[PDB]
A paper describes a structure:
Among the most commonly used non-immunoglobulin binders are monobodies (Mb), which are generated from large combinatorial libraries using a fibronectin III domain (FN3; ~10 kDa) of human fibronectin as molecular scaffold. Two crystal structures of heterochiral monobody-SH2 complexes reveal targeting of the pY binding pocket by an unconventional binding mode.
We determined the crystal structures of the l-DAM21-d-Abl SH2 and l-DAM27-d-Abl SH2 complexes at 2.7 Å and 2.9 Å resolution, respectively. In both structures, we found the d-SH2 domain to be dimerized via a disulfide bridge of Cys198. The rippled β-sheet position Glu85 in the FG loop is inserted into the SH2 pY pocket, where it forms an ionic interaction with SH2 residue Arg171, which is part of the conserved FLVRES motif and makes the most critical interaction with the phosphate group in pY peptide ligands. In DAM21, FG loop residue Asp83 forms an additional ionic interaction with Arg194, unique in the Abl1 SH2 domain and therefore a possible contributor to selective Abl1 binding. ITC measurements showed no detectable binding, thus validating the critical role of these residues for SH2 domain binding and interface 2 as the biologically relevant protein interaction site. In DAM27, Tyr79 packs towards the β-hairpin and His88 is solvent exposed, whereas in DAM21, Trp88 is rotated inwards and would clash with large hydrophobic or aromatic residues at this position. As observed in the DAM21 crystal structure, the monobody CD loop is not involved in Abl SH2 binding.
Numbering used by the authors:
A (entry chain H): 6 to 98
B (entry chain A): 142 to 240
The structure:
Amino acid sequence: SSVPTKLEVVAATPTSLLISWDAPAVTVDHYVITYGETGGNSPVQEFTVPGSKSTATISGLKPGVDYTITVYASDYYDGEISWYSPISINYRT
Amino acid sequence: XXXXXXXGXXXXXXXXXXXXXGXXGXXXXXXXXXXXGXXXXXXXXXGXXXXXXXXXXXXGXXXXXXXXXXXXXXXXXXXXXXXXXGXXXXXXXXXXXXX
Ligand SMILES: [Cl-]
C-alpha cells in the first residue's frame, strides 16, 4: 500500500547506490527521493526526479553506514498536489 | 461513455491505487477534472477504498442515496451493482483502466 510499490538497490559502490522502483499505472507528477542515516539525528537529504523515471543514483554516502532510502510519488489533480504513501528501504554500503 | 467502470478524469488518490490490487466489489467511477459534471464512486471493501460523491439535481437526475434517484449514470451503476443501498457493498468488479 504505497506508491511506488517496489524499491530496490540495483547496483552499489561503497559511496553510491543505484535504486529502481516500479512506476505506477497512473501519472506521477514527480518523485522525491530522500535518504539519511538510519541513526536518526543525521541530516536527511532529498532530491526530486521526473514522474517519467523509475531509477535514481544516490552518491556521496559514508561507506559502511546504514541509510534509509525513501521514495515519494505525487499526484497532481484539480489544482491540488498530494502525496501517496511512501516506500522506504534500509541499505548498508 | 466508455463503460468498463468509467475511468473519467482520475484523482481520488489515483483511484485508490487503481483499486489497490482489487477485491470486494472492485470499483470505478471517476470525475473531477475542471468540473467533469461532478463525479464519484470509489469502491473497495475489505482492503480499504470507500468514496461516494454522486449527488445531482437541477433536472439531471443522479443518486448516491436520496431515496433511489436515477436519470443516467449507468442506471445508477446497475442498481447499486444489485443492492448496496448506502454503499458498503454492491458494485461488482469494474477496475482495469490502465491496470
Ligand atoms: Cl455496463
